[PDB]
């Protein structure tokens, strides 16, 4: 269902752009809209090669895949965090009561 959501979403974007193409034409896509379009081309000009590098290192990792003492302090800190969380939530209750 999620793949279908992304796919029909791309399709809906297609139908939207095509409806805004067929009708709104007529030397009418103008000043403010033109500004929007220019800002959009700009952002499009504003990475990809880093992404190829990401896939690269990821393939590298995918192929590469192909302490009783410490637990005490770790769990003590976890208990401390569980102690602090509730006091913060009480802060929030006091906030809502203040509003």
């Amino acid at each position: 269902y999620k793949r279908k959501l992304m796919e029909l979403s791309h399709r809906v974007l297609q139908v939207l752009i095509k409806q805004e193409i067929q009708r709104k034409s007529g030397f009418a896509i103008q000043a403010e809209e033109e500004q929007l379009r220019v800002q959009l081309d700009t952002i499009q000009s504003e990475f990809k090669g880093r992404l190829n590098e990401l896939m690269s290192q990821i393939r590298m990792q995918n192929h590469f895949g192909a302490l009783r003492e410490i637990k005490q302090h770790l769990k003590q800190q976890q208990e401390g965090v569980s102690h602090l969380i509730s006091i913060i939530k009480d802060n929030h209750e006091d906030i809502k009561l203040i509003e």
């Binding site: 139908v15 805004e20 009708r23 929007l36 990475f47 992404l51 990401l54 290192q57 590298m60 990792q61």
Partner: protein, 100 residues
């Protein structure tokens, strides 16, 4: 989202058949669609650098260490300390207003 968007596009395409104009909507739509992919690009590059540092460690990785635990422990201690300081600011502001 996607269903109702297809619905709106179909409805606007239906009203045009007789005579209409519903176009500013898809304009703002393409605007938001670009604004979305904007952050995802930075995400792609940040993940790039993440995989880079990971594999940099992995070429070095043929061994492990015991100190990183103590480092992360002291850092998480100062961290939750700052977090509780922030929560204290929040409780004190709640109390200031609820006393006002």
């Amino acid at each position: 989202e996607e269903l109702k968007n297809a619905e709106i596009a179909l409805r606007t395409q239906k009203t045009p058949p007789g005579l209409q104009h519903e176009n500013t909507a898809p304009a703002d739509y393409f605007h938001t669609l670009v604004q979305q992919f904007e952050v995802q690009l930075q995400q792609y590059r940040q993940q790039i650098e993440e995989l880079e540092n990971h594999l940099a460690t992995q070429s070095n990785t043929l061994h492990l260490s015991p100190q990183d635990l103590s480092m992360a422990m002291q850092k998480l201690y100062q961290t939750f300390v700052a977090l509780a300081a922030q929560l204290q600011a929040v409780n004190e502001n709640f109390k200031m207003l609820k006393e006002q």
